Symmetry: D2
Subunit: 380 residues, 4 copies
């Protein structure tokens, strides 16, 4: 197998430790790191690589990403360059991807994926325990979108549709590389696209549970997720007219109880988030709210003077999601700020009325949210 680590700016020791782990693994025949640019990290890996490959007997290489997509040059270009490398320059049967900022990586992850793949699956997705306020794009954006647009499919049931840790066999990789919808998603939307297209093509999927979790880079206020947010949404919007006549085999490793240290952390800075909700207003944003239901429109307007979020419950969010699907303009700064404020209030609402009731309550709640979304969507 080929193992890939896409990296942008990361601590060299962190990624070098992972590369080391993969190279040492009996089933890994090559490690590739795909860089955004020739930085500190790049230089480090390149210097370490020859040594590592000699030590482990398995070749390690670094490359810059190629520009293959048409949106912002980001993670997509990174991953798809790896798909190209894999398909056009190696003979390997399987490719793994793992995010480079992972600090809890172990041979573990590789073994479990390889063993599922031996069982027959086309795509193996790793998924992890999560803190109740983690994964707010995954839930409020990706899984929500999937539930609302494709209720009868397996899409909304994928646990971590955004997750960078996965194993594809060669023909699944070939299919994804050759698809032009995926190819052009050069930005953060890449994972959404891999997820959507493998499901739509009926690839059989296994979700692998990694118990010790995914310990990686942590967030301040919500707005260091802002690009990713707009991009992940734009990805769902771009797919909204797709049909998914059937269907994919899909099994999930049964999850263990969350580790305590993972359940007991806050995924973001509340005070800062509340503050930011009052900032970067624009007469045009105010005007754009004329497109939304009254509670949401009054709701968000209040945010110019003081934080408001009680209004953004489940039902308001679904209403908001439809208006966004239909009017949101990718790349318009006002639409992007508006989507950001809107998602913010959904996350604050959820944090204060649900997450604050406990880990378990908040999981019951998210699952039951998707179900309600699916039911509602199936009804029209």
């Amino acid at each position: 197998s080929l193992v890939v680590f896409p990296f942008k700016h990361e601590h060299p020791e962190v990624l070098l430790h992972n590369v080391r782990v993969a190279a040492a693994h009996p089933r890994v025949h090559e490690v590739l790191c795909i860089g955004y640019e020739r930085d500190q990290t790049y230089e480090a890996v390149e210097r370490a690589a020859p040594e590592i490959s000699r030590a482990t007997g398995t070749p390690v290489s670094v490359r810059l990403q190629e520009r293959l997509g048409t949106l912002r040059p980001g993670k997509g270009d990174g991953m798809n360059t790896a798909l190209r490398y894999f398909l056009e320059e190696t003979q390997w049967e399987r490719i793994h991807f793992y995010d480079a900022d992972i600090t809890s990586f172990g041979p573990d992850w590789i073994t479990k994926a390889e063993e599922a793949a031996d069982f027959g699956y086309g795509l193996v997705r790793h998924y992890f325990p999560r803190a109740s306020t983690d994964a707010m794009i995954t839930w409020m954006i990706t899984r929500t979108g999937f539930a609302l647009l494709w209720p009868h499919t397996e899409l909304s049931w994928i646990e971590q549709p955004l997750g960078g840790e996965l194993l594809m066999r060669r023909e699944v990789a070939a299919m994804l590389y050759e698809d032009e919808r995926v190819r052009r998603r050069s930005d953060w939307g890449i994972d959404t696209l891999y997820t959507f297209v493998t499901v739509q093509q009926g690839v059989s999927i296994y979700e692998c549970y990694i118990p010790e979790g995914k310990a990686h880079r942590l967030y301040g206020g919500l707005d260091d997720l802002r690009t990713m947010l707009v991009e992940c949404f734009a990805a769902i919007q771009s797919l909204q007219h797709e049909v998914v006549g059937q269907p994919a085999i899909h099994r999930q490793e049964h999850p263990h109880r969350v580790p305590v240290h993972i359940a007991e952390r806050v995924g973001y800075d509340v005070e800062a988030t509340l503050h930011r909700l009052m900032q970067h207003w624009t007469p045009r944003q105010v005007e754009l709210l004329e497109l939304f239901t009254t509670p949401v429109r009054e709701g968000l307007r209040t945010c110019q003077r003081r934080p408001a979020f009680n209004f953004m419950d489940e039902m308001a969010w679904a209403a908001t999601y439809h208006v966004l699907l239909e009017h949101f303009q990718p790349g318009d700064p006002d639409w992007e700020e508006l989507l950001f404020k809107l998602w913010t209030t959904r996350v604050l609402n959820y944090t204060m009325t649900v997450a604050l009731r406990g880990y378990d309550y908040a999981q019951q709640y998210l699952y039951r949210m998707l179900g309600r979304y699916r039911y509602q969507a199936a009804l029209e």
Copy 2:
């Protein structure tokens, strides 16, 4: 819809309460009770029925089961009688079954099933939280069997393959009642057969989670499960050469955290169970053990003098299961007793080495068990 309660010997007030709940439900058009014989319970329901249907506007009736199968006349004959009544004597589009001895039934259960059916599913199964020592036939016999025999199918993933609580749509009922394999399963094997063939014909299945659990009749020593145990095993064994098939298609409501009162109970009497392990021995049973691996043969023999069960771990059990599949003679008193003792030691082993480590630990274990069994099966 038609709602059916199969009853053998139960407290009239318990069943009458359930009937009342069903009849009151806005989506129920008929309630049917299927009795084993004309006993106390039967008489109670028959007297109450005319009154209840007048009170609720939906017809309620009682009938004896018909002899439709060829094994012991038991629950199968009751449920298949209901299928016949449903298909040949009503116009209804959906049939529910619920065990009569349920004391936590509410409109709840009916609504949830009817809603999933509206979504599109062909079979909706109710499943419940469980005490770590509950459902030992489900786990050690039914799900084990499905994992060992059909690893690439959805069979071993069904949560409660013995569950009496389900909704079928008319065409699914028609298909089952027509199937001779199922029709003949007059005994406890019926539920196994419903589970097996619906999966094998690619019916689409939703598992509904009932959070407040299923509070019903409780067990003393393991041996008041003994007929059920031999009959449920016989059912797996009778299907052992089937193939399969289609995919199809299977989704589970996400389970909530187990209620405390359900996690904090012991599902059987350990002392009695150890005692019973030493009883009903037979020279022929001692002989029949010659057919089993050494640790098991030596293990079970010790049980004539004192209780032994540490030998019966996962791998020993799987080995045992294969010898049983291939040599167990349904209806042979020595084979039945032996299966009983064998299974007892497995339950005891699980109780002392797994269940005693906690509710969570014991669930991780059982799920992981089925996975190991599936991996091992797919290896040959």
Copy 3:
């Protein structure tokens, strides 16, 4: 024993149920309800009493509170009137108090307190499981005060020093009724005084765990807690030069795991709380902040424009507490509102950075909080 229910405004059926429960108890010889005014509730009880007292054989009566203290006529006058009645007009050996608004009251509570009293203890205090956002005056005012001022004593170790549910023996009641420090506490400060002086007097104390919790009247925003906040702080402040001897007998029934329904609730409405933090400002309050450390002064100032609360950790709170003890003027509207805003940020800081982390986490944290406060006070 005498059982007393102090009431101000409550639902008659709620209180009447409680009175009925007490009157039926084999150990209860008299039930007394102490009212604030002759309202609806009062009239209800007085009509119902003669019956009850006939139905159960134990006398039930209602009286208005007397004016005995010198602060706001509130709960203190209510409870001390009971003490006077108990001592001067009855021969009973033991008095219980229970809040009238309790909806989870049962013979239970009485039995457990009477049995501890039999063991010998002078005072028996009932304590309950709590939601992580409950009891923010208990924690951030009373237990905090106790730790910071009397670190070597048993004070900060009482679980629920504001608790209205307790049993005293006659001599304890006589001691309290005779103390003018307690007598004058006519307002909400009464429970703090009962707690303080029985500890100061080396009364032996037993804390009795009520597992089903105390289900009573719930709160909106934090600010319907305002009068109780300022009067509970005033109480601590009034005691600040007291010296407390050396630790008596104090024993606590071991707490069970919190019930899920109690752990899973939010104890207040976060939006309204953030809003209220920006209201009722005054140029004098702004000036008064010149008395506080820089972080807290700048922190609270920001609240005129947007909610700010991250500055208010543990140590800032302690610092602020010290400034309050020394400068807070009871009865001054600006000091009162200032105290209110200050507490509010302790509570918000704590909800966002600690409660959000889990029920367990937030309890570890509060206990470790008192310990850090004790250590710090001990240090000078």
Copy 4:
């Protein structure tokens, strides 16, 4: 401070690690290891001392225990030799003891004990989270005894009265070493004796919570606790007529949630334990049962043929405890075997009816058990 490690037979690397941790600690001035005999361990430590005593600047020495007591030469003689060395040959103000076989020791333990000492306490006891089937002597013998014989005292409230981990100040050590009751307890009984007399003399006690637990040597069947069992019982019996007539001050650090890895282990081998129950019978033992209540007499007699333990609930156990206190003969092999079997059935009972219900349930139970024992004792 002097830190002492008593050792009999242990792995050098385990003990040597702990020695290293103590010596490195800024508050430790001398480390002493007290050995049973000049074995492997002894030789290892003696070789290493020197080296350690020298990379830390704090002297480390080993000695053989002296024969100071009059029972079996065991732990008592070791601990008391340490006391003697401490008092007669050093100037240090405080002595710690830690078990040698601990594998989770860290500077931690010493710091916490030293800081409590600094706060004033005369004895600091470390206590740890436990598996539900751990500590069966502590609960069913020591704490039970304390609760039945001294209900009004602090004795049964000490969390780990057998714990080897504690800090005494010089005067408390002096007092204990001077006490002939403790001096003669040369065997396992020593810890019971330190616990009893420090409480009896009104030494003020702090219990220190060590969250990471005490990882040490594990048990097979219950019978490798057999000498310890009889000696610990003998200890309580020898003290049965003592009077306890003052307050100790007694405070317990609030415990954190049990770590999962500690909650999820089985503390013994059930199958072996059941087998052992049927062994080493004797006509005299059968006779001696004549002294016990009928359920217990008939119950234990069944154990000659098959394991029986349902009879040994709480109340049977208390009854049995009283018969033992009054008739058990230390050093009589039949009384010793009988006590062992009796206690085994108690442990089995608690295991199957209680521990199997969950970690929390089992703790609620043990605490409530002492409660009931205390109430019952206080009633006569």
